Amino acid sequence: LYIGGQDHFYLETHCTIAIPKGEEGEMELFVSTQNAMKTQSFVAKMLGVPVNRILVRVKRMGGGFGG
Amino acid sequence: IIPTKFGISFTVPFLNQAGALIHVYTDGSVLVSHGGTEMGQGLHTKMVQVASKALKIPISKIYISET
Numbered sequence: 277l278y279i280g281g282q283d284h285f286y287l288e289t290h291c292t293i294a295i296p297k298g299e300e301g302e303m304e305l306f307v308s309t310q311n312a313m314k315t316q317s318f319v320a321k322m323l324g325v326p327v328n329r330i331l332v333r334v335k336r337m338g339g340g341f342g343g
Numbered sequence: 344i345i346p347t348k349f350g351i352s353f354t355v356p357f358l359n360q361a362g363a364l365i366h367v368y369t370d371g372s373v374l375v376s377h378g379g380t381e382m383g384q385g386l387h388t389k390m391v392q393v394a395s396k397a398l399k400i401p402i403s404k405i406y407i408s409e410t
């Protein structure tokens with residue numbers, strides 16, 4: 277038996293705004309994510325910066341469904 | 344030659360209260376937030392220095408972003 281995959285098709289696609297603060301590696305991010313913690317960590321690790329420097333903010337998503 | 348004595352506290356009793364909020368992220372990086380504002384008197388510097396002593400960690404792991 278086989279079962280095909282599936283696209284999330286959340287009506288709102290992936291989207292991120294990133295605001296660099298110019299001080300000490302600080303950045304503030306608005307993102308359509310269900311996982312602001314991992315967003316924050318993955319950004320920090322990409323930058324070579326401590327996690328305390330990165331702020332992620334999540335108002336709402338136009339769908340997520342795990343995607 | 345002239346001396347001074349200056350009384351320390353708000354003269355309205357209820358303003359002598361203070362809040363802090365502390366997060367430790369999973370990289371050990373610590374973010375401190377408290378009710379004070381920085382205006383050049385170096386309050387955050389002092390607050391970083393206090394958090395560092397208290398926790399027994401270098402100042403480099405502590406950060407204050409804003410009020």
Ligand code: XAX
Nearest residue numbers: 284285286287310311337338339340341342343
């Ligand atoms: N309208 C709407 N409903 C939705 C979601 C959505 O994006 N939009 N997604 C699902 C998913 S998919 Mo997942 O384990 O991250 S694979 S769990 C999960 C679930 C997460 O929401 P709680 O019920 O825990 O608060 O919401 C469901 N209902």
Ligand SMILES: O=C(O)c1ccccc1O
Nearest residue numbers: 350352353354355356358
């Ligand atoms: O007593 C003070 O020094 C004081 C200072 C600022 C505001 C209210 C106050 O009572």
